[PDB]
């Protein structure tokens, strides 16, 4: 894929934090896969929302990674958040794209969704994705998401004008997502 090719001249490989965590979540030993543990169980860590971020964040310039939802099973939150993201309680303020603060694409179901801050947008791809390839580019402010099987089909595209530094952000309802190693 020379589209792949091009985004991967920027590729990340960001590994999760484990401090920001919910309890219920468990984090492999190379930090790069998260699943929902059988039993559930401070202050950095999301009190009530089954979130997660990364330990690096991107304040300029151009980025990609890639975030594989293929044991992820009928539910999922994949995007990007300013580290201002609330992390106590369930509220709008604290659930990824719910806010000012947060970008995600959204599987419930069937369903598939782009959110951001009372805006939302319905998409329709061909096939379950099976893995999303995230594009920022921050001074553009652009981010971009992709359908990465199926041909790095386009699947939407966040525009704003960001205002701090963005870290890769998940959140589960069941299995386990990871972030493939990229070159």
Same mark, same amino acid.
């Given at each position: 894929s020379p589209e792949r090719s091009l985004l991967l001249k920027y590729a990340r490989t960001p590994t999760l934090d484990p401090d920001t965590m919910h309890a219920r979540l468990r984090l492999s030993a190379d930090r790069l896969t998260v699943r929902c543990g059988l039993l559930g169980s401070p202050v950095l860590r999301f009190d009530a929302l089954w979130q997660v971020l990364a330990r690096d964040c991107f304040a300029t310039g151009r980025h990609y990674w890639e975030v594989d939802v #293929?044991? $992820? =099973? $009928?539910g999922w939150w994949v995007g990007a958040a300013y580290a201002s993201l609330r992390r106590r309680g369930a509220s709008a303020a604290a +659930?990824? =794209?719910?806010? +000012? #603060?947060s970008w995600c694409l959204k599987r419930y179901d069937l369903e598939y969704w782009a959110f951001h801050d009372g805006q939302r947008s319905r998409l329709r791809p061909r096939?379950?994705?099976?893995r999303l390839g995230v594009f920022l580019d921050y001074e553009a402010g652009v981010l971009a998401f992709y359908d990465v099987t199926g041909g790095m089909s386009h699947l939407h595209t966040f525009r704003a004008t960001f205002q701090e530094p963005l870290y890769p952000a998940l959140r589960l309802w069941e299995g386990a997502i990871s972030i493939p190693r990229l070159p």
């Open positions: #293929q044991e $992820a =099973g $009928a +659930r990824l =794209g719910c806010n +000012r #603060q096939d379950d994705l099976d």
